Structure formats: structure tokens, C-alpha cells
Amino acid sequence: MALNLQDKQAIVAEVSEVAKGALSAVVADSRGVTVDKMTELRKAGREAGVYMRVVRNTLLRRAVEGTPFECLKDAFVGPTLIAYSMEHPGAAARLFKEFAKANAKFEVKAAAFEGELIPASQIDRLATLPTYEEAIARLMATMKEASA
Amino acid sequence: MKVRASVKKLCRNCKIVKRDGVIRVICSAEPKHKQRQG
RNA sequence: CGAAAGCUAUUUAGGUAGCGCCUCGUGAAUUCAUCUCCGGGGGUAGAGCACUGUUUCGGCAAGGGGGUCACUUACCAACCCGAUGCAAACUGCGAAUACCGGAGAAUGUUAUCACGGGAGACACACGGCGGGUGCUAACGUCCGUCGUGAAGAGGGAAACAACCCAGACCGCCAGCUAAGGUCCCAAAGUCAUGGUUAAGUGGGAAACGAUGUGGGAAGGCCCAGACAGCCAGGAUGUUGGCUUAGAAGCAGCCAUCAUUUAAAGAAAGCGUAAUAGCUCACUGGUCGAGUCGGCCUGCGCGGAAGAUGUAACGGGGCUAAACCAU
RNA sequence: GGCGGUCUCCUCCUAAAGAGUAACGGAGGAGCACGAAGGUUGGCUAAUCCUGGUCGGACAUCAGGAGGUUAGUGCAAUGGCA
RNA sequence: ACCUCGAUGUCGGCUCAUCACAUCCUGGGGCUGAAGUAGGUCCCAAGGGUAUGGCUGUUCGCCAUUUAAAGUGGUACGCGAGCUGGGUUUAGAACGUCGUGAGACAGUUCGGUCCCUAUCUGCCGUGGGCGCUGGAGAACUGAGGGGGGCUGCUCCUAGUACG
Ligand SMILES: [Mg+2]
Ligand SMILES: [Mg+2]
Ligand SMILES: [Mg+2]
Ligand SMILES: [Mg+2]
Ligand SMILES: [Mg+2]
Ligand SMILES: [Mg+2]
Ligand SMILES: [Mg+2]
Ligand SMILES: [Mg+2]
Ligand SMILES: [Mg+2]
Ligand SMILES: [Mg+2]
Ligand SMILES: [Mg+2]
Ligand SMILES: [Mg+2]
Ligand SMILES: [Mg+2]
Ligand SMILES: [Mg+2]
Ligand SMILES: [Mg+2]
Ligand SMILES: [Mg+2]
Ligand SMILES: [Mg+2]
Ligand SMILES: [Mg+2]
Ligand SMILES: [Mg+2]
Ligand SMILES: [Mg+2]
Ligand SMILES: [Mg+2]
Ligand SMILES: [Mg+2]
Ligand SMILES: [Mg+2]
Ligand SMILES: [Mg+2]
Ligand SMILES: [Mg+2]
Ligand SMILES: [Mg+2]
Ligand SMILES: [Mg+2]
Ligand SMILES: [Mg+2]
Ligand SMILES: [Zn+2]
């Protein structure tokens, strides 16, 4: 490994994603294959490319060293194996969705999805999301309200 | 097993052991590497 | 009182002669020795490479080998220059010792020199040191020089002329020591303090082998979780290219980048006809405080097979009754 | 022991910085030459290489320059010799 | 060139041995380029066993035929005060060879006397004496010592495992 001069970058970089981010998910990759990463990188791909991460770090000692910053709801995620996912642009989006759909294709556990932060809380798969731009679901709420 | 005076590891799996007064070599992969009189 | 086994010469070599060394007598100078100081020559030990030879690398380059009939050539190479070694018969340097001479004090039973009377001896041995020869083999051989035995008993080295300590005029049932020793055979410490070894090492032996073990100086990684386990992954261009019947991470050659990443070598090993297949490096998890491996050193381990009977401490026996220090 | 070799003289080493010092130890010479190759007097100074130069070359003779005895010595080796 | 030259008998066989282990066979193993049968190699093992003949003086070696095997060494190249006397060295003789010759040869060739009544040690046997604590007849105990320790082949297992 590297000394501190390097354990600091994995911090100053990874914590300015939290400081400058959008949504957060969860997942434990016990059996995390590489067809695994391959896929989810195309997903990050659709979800821009390299706007997304997953930098395995669940050393509390790392991606909690980014938490007493923001998201101290994660002192509780960080135990055991974890795969932290941050969003920069994009809706508070679909990121959420396929992690459940992925891991529900066996694709290993999902930490039961211990969940995360947009609010400041816990678990439950939501597509309360990428409807986003479904302001059309407030366009159809126009003419249909005007007519009916 | 080979007897020799100089014994030394051969495979990465050869191990070296001091049983009784005698120095030995045990390989878990390759029987040819057993050694004594070390 | 007290030698010699040497020199020289010898139809001489196990003989003999002169000299050397022994003894007796006589005579003679501060004569002779040791130390100190002063005055000398030296080319050995050592070192050095200008010389004489030898020798390596670099540079420079006369000259040699193929191609023409004097030119030409992906062959070898003296000198001088710079660097580095080697010498019994090399010296541009150079000791300690030794030797000659002068002076001076102390000590020594004239230890000195001469002359004369009598000799013996001219087969030496081992040990230390410097050497030649041999194999830096021989209890071998041949010089130098000192010691001892010879011609010297006594104590030590188990026993052992030649080693260590020490020079027996006679007596002593006194004492102190030397070498060497001190648990029993067996005189004297089951002594003191601090360490080491676990091998009966001590009490036979090398190259070399090895997580035995003690000590020292320094270094790397560590609760931003190290070292070892255990769960995971260990991937895409792509069988890299070349070369092969086949070289697909892995027979060889050249390259060894670039992706995707948490990390993953164009691969450290198993495997394959070649692929396939199993691991490693590396990273994520778990775990929860130390951990890794070089340097220098002490003592030990293997290596280690012999003939009548233990038979490689003299024995018993010893974990100190072994080794280091005081 | 025989067979071989050796037997006298000079020189170096072995030889341990005075002399001396052995081996069937390591290497080489001598058993002469010269009446000048002796005496004295006067005078003279080498090897090798670079440069230039007819025949001429790697090396004849000339010239200068380096060099400084690396040459010479009637014969071995040593020590000497301006 | 240290012992023996006021004698320390030499090759080979015979008889009798005895130790070592660097093990020939038999025993126990590891590895194997070990399928099996069977080998190779290293380790451990010295208990026992370990060939008759042809040729030659031989040892040896070659050859024949056996065998589980036909081991390597030490023991004055064990063993002549035990045997032999073929080899090698007495005087005879000849060949080739050298030499003028006498003669000579690790050249060859034919022929020739190996003695000793065992004092001591040792060793195989066998008695006498005394001891062992009154004398005596038996039967014992067993410290200790010695002896012995080899192996083939056929059948069954099974033409099975393996191939
Ligand atoms: Mg055992
Ligand atoms: Mg006297
Ligand atoms: Mg003499
Ligand atoms: Mg020297
Ligand atoms: Mg006198
Ligand atoms: Mg004499
Ligand atoms: Mg002698
Ligand atoms: Mg002498
Ligand atoms: Mg004495
Ligand atoms: Mg006296
Ligand atoms: Mg006393
Ligand atoms: Mg003492
Ligand atoms: Mg005592
Ligand atoms: Mg004590
Ligand atoms: Mg011992
Ligand atoms: Mg041994
Ligand atoms: Mg001298
Ligand atoms: Mg001297
Ligand atoms: Mg010319
Ligand atoms: Mg003698
Ligand atoms: Mg006699
Ligand atoms: Mg006799
Ligand atoms: Mg054995
Ligand atoms: Mg005999
Ligand atoms: Mg006869
Ligand atoms: Mg008889
Ligand atoms: Mg059949
Ligand atoms: Mg079948
Ligand atoms: Zn191995």
C-alpha cells in the first residue's frame, strides 16, 4: 500500500463528492465478480460514465473518514464489507433502482441495502425518481384538469 | 527421499522442518523434494 | 671441570689430519661479556613498478590475416599515455634485528688472549623461528639460528628422550611456590559474582547446508487496522508481437503498454499436445497489536563409514565437575 | 646399490640488509685472448625515437630535435664506469 | 628408511577361522521416468546364509552349469613350531638373447631334503586342593555365559487386482 500522502487523497477526493453530490446507495459484494463491475460501469456509463463511482473502502477508517463530514448516518453502514456509490449530476435517480434489480438477479447480497442519504435515513427501494422530468405527469395534469 | 548434505527449498511449497536432530524438507506438491541429513 | 657429532682436506664418506669445542699448567693487558650513549656500512622483512621481466582494462596505434599486383578488408595487435596486480636470481625506496668500532657505570671467581701438556669428537635427534627440496606430505630431506635430549634426575602433558615448569653435594615425617590443577579414583574451591551451550557440545574433521539460540547497530510496515489465517475477487484489448506442427500469462526472442478498476504482472509457480484447469503477486472484507527481513557478532546442529572389546574426557561420572570474564 | 650424472675454477640466487653458510636446489660461464686489446699524453661521448632529406625500404649515410647511457665494455654473471 | 640383517619364512592352495560394513541374498523403508511382473536409486539393517566345475602355479580372469545369493574389505596381502610345495631364489642342463670370455636375463625350459617331544600365555577337555563358618545326603533358585537365527519350489487366494 501507500503511506498517508495517499490515504489522504482517497479522502480529499472522495469526500468532495459528498460535499458536492446528490444521492447515496448501498451494497455488500461478497462474491463480487468482475462481470459485476463491468456491467455497473456501463450503468455508471448510462448514468453518465465516470460521474459515479463505487470505490470499495468500507474501512470506516476511510469512507467514514469522509462521513463526520456529511452523511453521519453511515457510522452504521460502514461495518463489514461495503460498496459506497455517490452521485454528482443526474436525478436523485435510478442508481437506486438497479442496485435492487441487479442484486435481485442473485448478483450477490445488497447489505439488505442498509440504505443512506438524500433525506438522512435508511432503507426502502424507491422509484420516487426519474419520473423526474415526468413533469409531463403535470402536463397531462393540465389539459385533463382543464377538460375533465 | 533425497539425503544430501545441503538441503534447501526447491518449490515455493517446499517447507523445511527440524524433526529429531535432523533437518528436513517437506513438499506438499512434489514428493521428489523430500530431503534429510541436512 | 666437561665436550662433539662442525669446518677444511682426504681411493674420503661408519677412518684420518689441522682448525673448532673439553681439560691441566704458565703468563698477560680493565683483557671479555651484559646495558646505556656515540660513530659506521647495509639492501633482508615490508613496500613499490622508474629499471629488468610479467599482467588486466581503457586510449592511441606502428605491425600481422582476406582483396588486387602498389591499393584494399564487420580479423589480431608492440610502443608511449592513463589505471591495476605479480618477482628467489626486479629496486627510483626501506626498517626491526644483527655486526664492527669508541666512551662510560655496575656486575661477573679471568668469564679474555696467548703459549704449552693431555684429550675426545668429526653417525646426531626433536622443538621454535627464517628458508631450499617434497605435496607449506612424512617421526622425510638439506642449510641458518636458538632451545632441549645426547651427557639431566625431579613436577606437569593418562602412559610419552626431544614439549611445559625446573638444573638433584648429603640428611629432614618443616615451610613457600613454578608448570599444571582443586566432585570420586587423586594432593587442593562441589569457591564468589555476571554471562553463554542442551549439543555429552565440552571429549576428532572441510566446502557447504539450516525459522537452533544469546548479544549489537541500523531499517521497513503498523488502530487512517500492519504480519498470518479466513471470505471474496484476481478482469477487457488479447492467443501482444515474433517463432513454432502447436508457444493462447507461462520452450525461446523482442516488447512489456493501455484499458476497467478497490486491485489484478502483456505474468511469480503448478498444469496443457496446445487451449482448458489450479495458484501467486495485487486489492476489497474479516480479524485486532504488534510485525517483517537484511548487517555485524557469541555458543551450538547436520555434513561424520572400519575392521579382537566400550576404545576420539585416562575411568567413574558431569548440565556444570562445560565455555567466557573478574 | 647399479645404470645416468657429477668431481677443479668464476658469476647470480637459495643466504635470513657484516663475513660465512647445505642439498642429485634454481640459472650460466672458465681451462683464454691482447706486444696493444699494456703505459702515458691530447681529444672525443652513446641507445632509441620524432621531423626533413636522391636512389632508400621498418631498419644503411645526412640534418635538426627529443632522450640522457636504456649504448659500450675482447667472452659468463654481478658489481662498476662520464 | 623409524623397528628386525648374533634370521622378523615369501606367492597360491588346504584346514581352521575371526572382525568391519562402503549389504551379494534374505528383512524394513523413501523416491521412481513405480500400471502389473520386474527394475533403478537412496535410507535403515551385520541375525543367518553367501556354487560345483574346465583352463592356468595362480590369486584373478574367461568359460560351462547352478543358486535366494555366489558381497567388498581387516586380521604380518589371518593361518608352513597345522599340512602342501605347483610359483619364486641353492648347486645340474638347454634354447633365444647379450658378451671376445668367465658369465648373464621380470626370457623361457626339464630336474631338486619345509626340522623342532610345547616351559609360559592362549585355547579345548578333565580332575586335585581349599574356601563358602558344626557335619552330612539330595533337590533347587538362575546373576551370568554359550548355542541356535538360512532359504527354494509347488498348490490354494487367483488367472481375481492390474493390464
Ligand atoms: Mg523419528
Ligand atoms: Mg658445570
Ligand atoms: Mg655430518
Ligand atoms: Mg616479499
Ligand atoms: Mg688461565
Ligand atoms: Mg667424518
Ligand atoms: Mg629426522
Ligand atoms: Mg645440522
Ligand atoms: Mg626430562
Ligand atoms: Mg644442585
Ligand atoms: Mg602451599
Ligand atoms: Mg595455572
Ligand atoms: Mg580430593
Ligand atoms: Mg558450585
Ligand atoms: Mg564428541
Ligand atoms: Mg560417524
Ligand atoms: Mg650477506
Ligand atoms: Mg644475518
Ligand atoms: Mg631513412
Ligand atoms: Mg631405520
Ligand atoms: Mg634379532
Ligand atoms: Mg629366529
Ligand atoms: Mg548402513
Ligand atoms: Mg599372508
Ligand atoms: Mg618346483
Ligand atoms: Mg613339518
Ligand atoms: Mg489369459
Ligand atoms: Mg479384465
Ligand atoms: Zn517442491
Contact of A112 with A124, CB cutoff 8 Å: no
Query: CA A62, CA A94: separation in Å to the nearest integer?
Result: 26
Distance A82 CA to C170 C1' (A): 111
Burial A104-119 (b: 16+ CB within 10 A, else e): eeebbebbebbbbbbe
The experimental method behind these coordinates is cryo-EM
Q: Which ligand is nearest to the CA of B26?
A: 29
Strand C, nucleotides < 7 Å from a protein CB: these are 199-200, 206-212, 221-225, 231-235, 260-264, 268-270, 282-286, 301-304
Q: What is the DSSP string of A29-78?
A: -TT--HHHHHHHHHHHHHTTSSSB-------HHHHTTTTTTS-TT-TTT-
Domain locations along chain A? 1-130
At residue A125's C-alpha, the angle toward residues A122 and A129, to 5°, is: 105
Strand E, nucleotides < 7 Å from a protein CB: these are 30-32, 42-43
Architecture of domain A1-130 in this structure = 2-Layer Sandwich (3.30)
